[PDB]
C-alpha cells in the first residue's frame, strides 16, 4: 500500500500571494510515464471537488491560477494568485496501486488585515424558562485572527464550569471567524444570580469587549 | 446526480448499510468509489465497484466492508459490520473518471455509530435584550439544544436571508448536542419585518419553525 504525507499540516497566505504545498509518496506513484496523483479541495460542508489530475493537468473548469507538478514520490499543488474563495482544505490521492490513498490533508488559511469581533449576549429565551433550562448566548463575529479568548462572569466572579465554545471555518468571502460561547446553567441557578457577563479578549483591541445585562422584569 | 441515502443512526452491534442511488450516467459504463470522513479529520478510501462489476478494498476494513450494486437500479450499496464508534463520519460516494480520478460526487450522508438514542432539539429563538434597539445593525440567534445525532440544519426565512448569517458547529456534551446561529441584519429590517428560524433533524424527522419576537 502505497502512503501518502502532506506537508505542512496548515499554512495561511495572503490574499494575492504564493501558496504552494507539498505530497510525499512512500514509494513511486508513476506508471508508463504517468503520475497517478491527484489533488482535492474541500470547503466547509461540501464533498471534495478535483483539481489537478495525473500530477500536472488542469481539471476543466478549475482556475488557472492552480497547478501542480512532481514525479515519483514528490509532488506539490501550487496557487497564484490566492483569492479569499480558496480557504478549504487540500488532500492529494493516489491510485498507482489498490487501495488508493488520501493524504491527511494541507488547511490552507487566508491571511487578512485584523479585525475587531462584534458581540452580542443572550439571555435564556422564556420558552426555554418555561422548560425548565438556562442557557446564556455569546456572539463574536467576524474577526481576525482565530485566536480568541471568551470570559464569563455571573455577579462578577468568573464561571468557567459549563460553558461550550464553538468556531465556525473561515468565511470564504471575508476571510474572518466568528465564535459562539455558551453558558448553561440550570433555571433554578440561573435565577439565583443578577448580572451575566461575556468578556470577548482578542489582539485588535486594548480594552476587553463587554456585554453584559441584568435579570429584570 | 449522485445521492447517498443511509439509516443516520446505527447500534455499535449491527451493521451499516448505505445506498449510493446515481443519475445522468449508468453503472455499466461508469464505477462508483465510497470515501468516508469522521468528523474534524481527512477523507478515506472506502473501495470501488468497478463499471464490469468487480470490486477492490481498503485494506483494513476489507474484511468487515462489502460493495455491491444493480445496474438496471441505478443503485450502489456499502455493507459494514463489526462497527466501532469511530466508523462515525460522512460516507461519500463518488464517480470514477477508467480509474483516475473521482469527477463527481454525492453530497455525503452522515453515518453515527452510538448506542444511545435518537432526540429531537428544541429550538429557542433569541431576541436581543429587552427594549428598544441601540444599533445600526441588529443581530439575533436560534439556540438549538439537547439533540442526537448529528446533523441539523439550519436556515433563516427559508435560506433566503444568507447574507450576514453564522452557523455554528455543534458542541457534544452528555450525549447529546447543542449547536447555535446569528444573523444580523440592519435595525430597518427587525423587528419590521419577521425573521424566522428554520431547523430540521433528519434522525427524529423533525422540523421547528421559529419566529424571533422581541422580548
Ligand atoms: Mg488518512
Known amino acids: 500500500d502505497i502512503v501518502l504525507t502532506q506537508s505542512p499540516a496548515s499554512l495561511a497566505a495572503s490574499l494575492g500571494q504564493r501558496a504552494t504545498i507539498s505530497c510525499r509518496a512512500s514509494?513511486?506513484?508513476?506508471?508508463?510515464?504517468?503520475?497517478?496523483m491527484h489533488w482535492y479541495q474541500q470547503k466547509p460542508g461540501q464533498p471534495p471537488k478535483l483539481l489537478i489530475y495525473?500530477?500536472?493537468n488542469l481539471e476543466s473548469g478549475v482556475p488557472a491560477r492552480f497547478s501542480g507538478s512532481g514525479s515519483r514520490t514528490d509532488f506539490t499543488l501550487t496557487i497564484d494568485p490566492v483569492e479569499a474563495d480558496d480557504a478549504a482544505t487540500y488532500y492529494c490521492?493516489?491510485?498507482?496501486?489498490?487501495?488508493?490513498?488520501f493524504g491527511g490533508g494541507t488547511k490552507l488559511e487566508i491571511k487578512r488585515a485584523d479585525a475587531a469581533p462584534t458581540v452580542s449576549i443572550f439571555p435564556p429565551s422564556s420558552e426555554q424558562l418555561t422548560s425548565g433550562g438556562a442557557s446564556v448566548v455569546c456572539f463574536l463575529n467576524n474577526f481576525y485572527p482565530k485566536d480568541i479568548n471568551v470570559k464569563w462572569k455571573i455577579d462578577g466572579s468568573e464561571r468557567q464550569n459549563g460553558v461550550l465554545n464553538s468556531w465556525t471555518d473561515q468565511d470564504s468571502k471575508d476571510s474572518t471567524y466568528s465564535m459562539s460561547s455558551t453558558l448553561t446553567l440550570t433555571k433554578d441557578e440561573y435565577e439565583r444570580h443578577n448580572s451575566y457577563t461575556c468578556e470577548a479578549t482578542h489582539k485588535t483591541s486594548t480594552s476587553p469587549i463587554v456585554k453584559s445585562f441584568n435579570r429584570n422584569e | 446526480q449522485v445521492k447517498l441515502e443511509e439509516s443516520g443512526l446505527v447500534a455499535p452491534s449491527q451493521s451499516l448499510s448505505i445506498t449510493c442511488t446515481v443519475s445522468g450516467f449508468s453503472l455499466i459504463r461508469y464505477g462508483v468509489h465510497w470515501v468516508r470522513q469522521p468528523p474534524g479529520k481527512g477523507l478515506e478510501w472506502l473501495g470501488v465497484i468497478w463499471a464490469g462489476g468487480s470490486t477492490n478494498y481498503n485494506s483494513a476494513l476489507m474484511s468487515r466492508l462489502r460493495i455491491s450494486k444493480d445496474n438496471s437500479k441505478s443503485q450502489v450499496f456499502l455493507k459494514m459490520n463489526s462497527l466501532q464508534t469511530d466508523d462515525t463520519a460522512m460516507y461519500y460516494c463518488?464517480?470514477?473518471?477508467?480509474?483516475?480520478?473521482?469527477?463527481?460526487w454525492g453530497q455525503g450522508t452522515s453515518v453515527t455509530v452510538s448506542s444511545a438514542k435518537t432526540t429531537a432539539p428544541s429550538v429557542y429563538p433569541l431576541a436581543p435584550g429587552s427594549a428598544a434597539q441601540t444599533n445600526s445593525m441588529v443581530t439575533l440567534g436560534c439556540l438549538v439544544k439537547g439533540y442526537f445525532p448529528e446533523p441539523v440544519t439550519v436556515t433563516w426565512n427559508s435560506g433566503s436571508l444568507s447574507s450576514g448569517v453564522h452557523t455554528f458547529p455543534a458542541v457534544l456534551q452528555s450525549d447529546l448536542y447543542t449547536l447555535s446561529s446569528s444573523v444580523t441584519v440592519p435595525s430597518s429590517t427587525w423587528p419590521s419585518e419577521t425573521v424566522t428560524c428554520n431547523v430540521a433533524h433528519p434522525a427524529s424527522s423533525t422540523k421547528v419553525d421559529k419566529k424571533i419576537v422581541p422580548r
Open positions: 463518488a464517480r470514477d473518471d477508467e480509474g483516475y480520478v473521482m469527477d463527481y
Open positions: 514509494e513511486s506513484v508513476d506508471s508508463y510515464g504517468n503520475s497517478f
Open positions: 490521492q493516489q491510485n498507482n496501486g489498490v487501495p488508493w490513498t
Open positions: 495525473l500530477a500536472s
